[PDB]
Amino acid sequence: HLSAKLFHDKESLLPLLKFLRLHSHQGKNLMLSEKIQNLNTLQHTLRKAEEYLAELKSETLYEEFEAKFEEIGLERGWGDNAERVLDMIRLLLDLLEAPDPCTLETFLGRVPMVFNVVILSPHGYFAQDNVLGYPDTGGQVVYILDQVRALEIEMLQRIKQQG
Amino acid sequence: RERLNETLVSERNEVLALLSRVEAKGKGILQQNQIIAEFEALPEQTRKKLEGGPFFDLLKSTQEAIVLPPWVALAVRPRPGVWEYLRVNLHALVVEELQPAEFLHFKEELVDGVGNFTLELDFEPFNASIPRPTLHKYIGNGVDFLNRHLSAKLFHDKESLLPLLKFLRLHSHQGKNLMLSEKIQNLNTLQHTLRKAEEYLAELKSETLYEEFEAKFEEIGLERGWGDNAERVLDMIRLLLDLLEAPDPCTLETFLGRVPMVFNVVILSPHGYFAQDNVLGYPDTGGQVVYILDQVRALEIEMLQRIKQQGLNIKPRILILTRLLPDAVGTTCGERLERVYDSEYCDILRVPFRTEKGIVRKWISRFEVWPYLETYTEDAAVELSKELNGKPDLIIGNYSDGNLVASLLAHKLGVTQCTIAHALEKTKYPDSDIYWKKLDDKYHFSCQFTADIFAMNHTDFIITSTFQEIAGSKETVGQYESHTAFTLPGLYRVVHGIDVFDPKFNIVSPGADMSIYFPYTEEKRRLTKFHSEIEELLYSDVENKEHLCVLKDKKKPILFTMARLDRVKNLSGLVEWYGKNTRLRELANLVVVGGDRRKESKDNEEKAEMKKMYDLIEEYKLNGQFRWISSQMDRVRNGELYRYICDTKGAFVQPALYEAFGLTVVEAMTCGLPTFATCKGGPAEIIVHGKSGFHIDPYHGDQAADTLADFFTKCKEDPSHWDEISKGGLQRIEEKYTWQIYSQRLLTLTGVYGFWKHVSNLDRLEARRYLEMFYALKYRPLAQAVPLAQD
Amino acid sequence: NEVLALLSRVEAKGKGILQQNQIIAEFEALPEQTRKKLEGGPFFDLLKSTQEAIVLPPWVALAVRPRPGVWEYLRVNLHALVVEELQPAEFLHFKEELVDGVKNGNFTLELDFEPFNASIPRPTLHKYIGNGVDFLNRHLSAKLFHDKESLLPLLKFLRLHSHQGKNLMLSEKIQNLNTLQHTLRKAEEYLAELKSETLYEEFEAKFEEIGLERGWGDNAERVLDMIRLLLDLLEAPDPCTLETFLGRVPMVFNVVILSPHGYFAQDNVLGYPDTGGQVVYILDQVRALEIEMLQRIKQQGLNIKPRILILTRLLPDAVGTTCGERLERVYDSEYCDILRVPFRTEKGIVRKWISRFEVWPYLETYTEDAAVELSKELNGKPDLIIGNYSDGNLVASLLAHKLGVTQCTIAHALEKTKYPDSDIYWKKLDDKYHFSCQFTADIFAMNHTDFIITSTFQEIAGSKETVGQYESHTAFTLPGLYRVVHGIDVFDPKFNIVSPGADMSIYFPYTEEKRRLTKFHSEIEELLYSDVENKEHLCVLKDKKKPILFTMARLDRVKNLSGLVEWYGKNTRLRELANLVVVGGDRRKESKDNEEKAEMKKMYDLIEEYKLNGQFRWISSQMDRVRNGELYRYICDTKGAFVQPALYEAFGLTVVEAMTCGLPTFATCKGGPAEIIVHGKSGFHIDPYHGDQAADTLADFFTKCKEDPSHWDEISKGGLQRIEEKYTWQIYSQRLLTLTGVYGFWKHVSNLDRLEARRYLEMFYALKYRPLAQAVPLAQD
């Protein structure tokens, strides 16, 4: 649905830009800067970013080309090296041109997003010992402990990969 | 309009940048390419240039510098497919940017000097239907774009889905019903029918043959064409259910590619001597022929598998329509119907040219066939009507006459159309657009350019062999691209000819037949049966129509080339470069194959070119370092010939002023022979300089010649150097140019565009009338103008 | 009735290879058969509605017109039955076989405009034919309704609107619908408290600050109304409000009118070949258009001085006329001038008058020259361009294109309908009439123009039984040249019926004595009643007391005056009842025109053959409208009648002129007069194809009026009332100006989709007209 609504409808694409422009965490600005006010300069910048990066060595750290990026309106979060920033930028360019579901998902999943997570489990005796089997204390408790542990490994992984 | 700024740098660099803008004025009343615009005062400048700052922008990318009265106009191309036209004047200031139609006005004043209501062709209005990619990535990728649009349009729009239903509902072959029967009158029942089918089918065994459930299917409204077994019928049913629900690009393409569609194929290749033997190297007879022959073989094999897999027994037929030449002796060009070697279903179908005085017997040059094509279309319609069982499912045009005809044919018969340029003469003959009038009596370029612009927009999709054929490179303009804005002063002005972003361009790269051309290093496969013949061909002391001069030293590496002999192929030029460079003549022997000296020659360029070769031999005293070999018509022996050059550790050089694709380049590499190809056109893309081969510049040949001397010099020092490039090439080929994926791609495209054709019928209706009128009132007159051949 | 149709289909086959019209198809077929007719069933109506049937040996093709604008094409084998549906293109194949022996080339050009115009949905109703502005209004109204993207055009339009560098409406300060909104409200409060009559000079200082430029009104009351209209459009657009506003915005200041052929002047011309109602129409038009134009410019609070140029051809050697001067003021106007530019070639300018059928090779250069010459005359560029007839429409299109101006076209006649089967038979007519050129320009300007003005409904869609002038251009073919599958649509929103009128100061009832111009009587008496035969008038009337059967017109084949003379000549009863007075041809000089020259011989001969002396007075061209008006009123005095026996008449200003004077009129039923007159009420119809009946009908009128004198006065009154209601110049000027505004704006909205049609017509002009035009032999001095 998004993939289709996102195809050459300008009034449709703006939201994605607002998203990336407003996107920030803990006072640090992410993805697009405030210097980018519209799809036009967004398209322009992304392109300008592609040309440049295409030339650098794959494993080049974001820090190197960071100076240039900050000028043209690009803040952190695209990737840790040039290779990863390259793909991420290429994907977004694609969403602006010819949106498809695989691309839409793959990109929205890559944007560093989940940092702080709140999980709600009020009832039962929720603990890591001397609990399981008490009234109301059961698979939910077991499920949630396994979940956060797994979830934390991924979140670190994703935070690292996006630089 | 950013590029009109970096030039305002006259305020900073002025006393310098108005110099290069001068030493151009010191050429005068003309135009010149980057080679000239750049290599003029820029290199010929003094250290008082120091212009390697902000200004190198426009110079470095400026396609043509057109000198005029005090005003000089530049054409600047920031990115492929984007054009800004500018004019300042020489010494003086005030440089103002120009509109497209206006920039052409300035080009026309360069010849005629001044026809107010003189025609403008503009196609941009006639296509705004689907939007167009602004992204480099989608150039030559258009089907991927059309898919994504089609997917979107199809997504939950009731009315929007109906087209797909009707498509499968009407669809049929030779009166037999395929896909959906007439029972399904709306999406409601189709949704329901498909669902019930999947139920029944999901239950049965994987390998269960269609015949089992055909009974049930026929009952519920489903005819054949879904698959041979149940496993395949299931997949197809799911694909469709999915396009009904939540369409996506991968699915749409997959399903549309899969529907049984292409059974009868019609291929137009009228000009030249089209045959499987005793032809190649003749005028107009060359890579287009080789390409079509490999093409149909591959296409047949894929078609057969698709038909089998979909649960059909239908017999495919592929016809190559060309001209019947009753008088070409020693060829088969006189026989109406001929089976293509190694195919069951591919046939050459020959139809004669005629006027009201009866058939026209003699061979005619590809530049002169125009008057004959419309009657050819009529007559071919009739003949292919006779041979074909049912009508054509796909029509593919080739080159200008072929594309012209295939357009007419497809309009007439109502069939999906593809075109393949194979070359575009406007890029091969520089400024032949602006200067067309003085060239017309010889090349009749007025008809061709018209046929080209006509077919280009008339076709449903276009196949190209490279990206360069569409948008070229970052530095230089593409072959199609150069047709976007041009003028033929006095005739008409093309404001928008074609758009490098049009969703109809698809790049499908051909290959070389791998049983003919393989690595020289496989001994088990070498054809030694041929070595006597080849030893004679290269090294014998007999001079005759088969070969001229002689090689004194038989152990040198051979510098090899092969091609039709015409001016653009530039074989004479290479012979000169070689002649002048003494170090190179020392290291290697020149062996050139082109032109047929067994018979007196009827082609203008060929004749001219034979004259130069004859002279050059005398001028540079080529005897003993040179061997001039006549046209080699047998591809099989040709394969062994390439490999043989490999044994000597030589190279293949292709010195053309422009080369639209260059199969010989693909061939040489496939054999493992290190290749030096021209940087103008396709080989620029085929070869990665230094890795899979090298590039040379036909405009600086003395440099080309010495580059070659460096290469041989290195290999004598380090023989592993020769091997390095040999492998580079072998790999590039395996990676890029091969026939396997070709047919699959081609069939899939036909499926997608065929359906697209039906949705979008309503908005192309205007462009259809436009194109009808262009042909009627522009082409027909120009063609009738062309002199008839005299028997 | 499977046994019957095989019969009529036989009778129709017996006629052989030809086409037959309903006048014949079913006219011979249905009644001329046995009593086997029994046809009151369904299959009857099919034939009864058939416009033509083209019969070839195995087959007959039928064009069926159930309702105006609605066509079906069918074929039937004359044996075996089997009716078969047919596409317009396939039906046209038949005509092409009928003539050349085979269809036009398989790849020969088919003109089809349908896919082009389609930008806006077609009206299906009879009511909207000729009413197109009404329809375009409901469309814009809706497209405008609460659509941001759709209101911008109106802002952009109003923001760029200017004249001669003086800004109008909105200034550059207003960049968006929001500030426009805010400003209009701000402007609304202000003007609400002010006195109605406060002049724009007062609040002018204020408006300029908030971005409002001049042209909203002359006083506060008017600026207020207008601003509120715009508020409404931005809020809740409706058709009436939209039109009113668009018609109010000051737009037309400079007007360019194209009328190149004939001898175009204010005196000493009318009745000369090619010189006739088109000239009259245009003169009355500019006069009235100027008045309204001044009216509006004042009201919107502007001081601009209008200009109206009528571009025509400079004829240096036409003597006795003013056709030799470059600039001429139109009598009774401040701002209207005739502007003459000469025809020329490489060899220099061409002196001699050239017939309308021959001008084509000259029309392109004319346009270029005209452009240059009107650039000198006009202050600013043209705000409106009006094409007239074929050569005029052709040149009006090229100018409109060149200058980017709003284009209207007025046919004034369409030759294809005047010369039956001139499309299918075009080839044998061409050396003489060059219809390949003309039809080409017709089709070209018809589509190229922004809107079209007609003088009658019949001019578009005809009547229930008969095809319309434009309607006949929808599907037609010119064997060997090209095929027109869809050339025009009778329902096209660009059509507008705006009826012209007769100048009310020149033509009025014969019964107002104070107004009659008696100073003319001496002359007219000699004109009608004198015993002298000369180049001014031929023969002589024996009895001055009989009523006069009067007609006046250009003298040519189609006006069919030699016909009327013959009808009258044959019929003794008519001859005793009244004298025939025919005004046509100028016999003072040698006639340089083909039809007129031949038409004169026909006339002369008839005079001898029918012994016309004593009953007949043949008068030369009366070139002065003033005396002519009185001449009309004199015919009234005798209790005579006006008769207009054309084979076809596109509109018929004479018929109007007659009726306006109170002179009972019998006019041809072929073409415009059919709509103008209501048989038995406003006058009577006659059929030029049955003359002897036309005559008898006239004799009957006169016999009646003799027995009952008050019967003459009934028709007289009916004619007068009819005119008062339908044909008058007053509204014309309002409508035309309004239309120019609505269509002017639509230009900016629809521009996206006329780009396609624009390139289509460009190629048609370039590769079709030009070549044809150049093929026409040039005149030689």
Ligand SMILES: O=c1ccn([C@@H]2O[C@H](COP(=O)(O)OP(=O)(O)O)[C@@H](O)[C@H]2O)c(=O)[nH]1
């Ligand atoms: O005495 C007990 C009972 C339960 N469990 C664990 O609690 C979870 C029960 O989850 P399940 O989904 O099976 O049932 P639920 O308690 O969620 O209804 C499982 O991990 C059990 O191994 C346990 O560790 N000790």
Ligand SMILES: O=c1ccn([C@@H]2O[C@H](COP(=O)(O)OP(=O)(O)O)[C@@H](O)[C@H]2O)c(=O)[nH]1
């Ligand atoms: O004397 C000749 C000349 C041509 N060729 C073949 O003709 C084709 C030429 O194709 P290319 O694209 O290189 O040149 P084109 O003729 O298309 O311009 C290649 O397959 C060559 O092997 C050949 O076999 N013998």
Ligand SMILES: O=c1ccn([C@@H]2O[C@H](COP(=O)(O)OP(=O)(O)O)[C@@H](O)[C@H]2O)c(=O)[nH]1
């Ligand atoms: O000898 C003539 C003939 C014509 N007229 C005028 O020319 C016009 C003819 O217009 P109409 O539309 O009736 O016929 P048209 O000439 O336009 O075909 C009328 O105003 C006539 O009064 C005239 O004044 N004197």
Ligand SMILES: OC[C@H]1O[C@](O)(CO)[C@@H](O)[C@@H]1O
């Ligand atoms: O009904 C299942 C119950 O057990 C839990 O998994 C907790 O162990 C909860 O979901 C709920 O209290």
Ligand SMILES: OC[C@H]1O[C@](O)(CO)[C@@H](O)[C@@H]1O
């Ligand atoms: O223009 C090059 C020529 O050679 C061909 O490849 C045929 O061998 C054609 O494309 C064209 O006739």
Ligand SMILES: OC[C@H]1O[C@](O)(CO)[C@@H](O)[C@@H]1O
């Ligand atoms: O075709 C009728 C003729 O009469 C006119 O109305 C002018 O008197 C013109 O439109 C045309 O020349």
Ligand SMILES: [K+]
């Ligand atoms: K951000």
Ligand SMILES: [K+]
């Ligand atoms: K079917």
Ligand SMILES: [K+]
């Ligand atoms: K304004």
